[PDB]
Amino acid sequence: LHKEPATLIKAIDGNTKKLMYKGQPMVFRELLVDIPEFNEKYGPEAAAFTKKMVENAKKIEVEFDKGQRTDKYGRGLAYIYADGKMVNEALVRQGLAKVAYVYKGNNTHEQLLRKAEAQAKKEKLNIWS
């Protein structure tokens, strides 16, 4: 896999899911995670967590997997990195998302993320508390 550059595009409502990739705006959806929505338990914590990670990054990169690059909603499907640190993994490791949506072809980092979840569960973090 390859990391490619992006930048955060500021949103009116403060969300940090839209990135500028090859010069164009694109909503990205993080591969391999289920992230609680704002109104669910740990929703506000997960949003604050990703927001701090992406907004403070000097460098954002996106990394496509080997399969589909966009979903049925037109969202980019990628591993998102903030100064070399993967957002998808960091959410899971902190118990702020679960490993989920594992489709064929786009599963390169599955075992890496499942290890993070196992560690988060062992430590009773957040969702696992």
- For ligand THP, the binding residue among 6, 19, 31, 127 (CB under 6 A) is 31
Q: Of the residues 4, 37, 40, 123, which is catalytic? A: 37
Residue 62 interacting with ligand THP (CB under 6 A): no
- For ligand THP, the binding residue among 26, 46, 60, 77 (CB under 6 A) is 77
Helix/strand/coil for 50:
helix
Q: Of the residues 45, 63, 75, 110, which is catalytic? A: 75
Amino acid 70 reads T
- 85 contacts 104 by C-beta, under 8 angstroms: no
- Following DSSP, what letter does each residue of 61-124 receive, concatenated? EEEE-SS-SB-TTS-EEEEEEETTEEHHHHHHHTTSSEE----TTS-TTHHHHHHHHHHHHHTT
Structure tokens at 71: 């979903």
State which residue, 30 or 56, has the beta carbon closest to ligand THP. Answer: 30
CB of 115 to ligand THP, least distance (A): 19
- For ligand THP, the binding residue among 21, 26, 29, 113 (CB under 6 A) is 29
Residues that bind ligand THP (CB under 6 A): 29, 31, 34, 71-72, 77, 101, 103, 106
**Catalytic positions:** 29, 37, 75
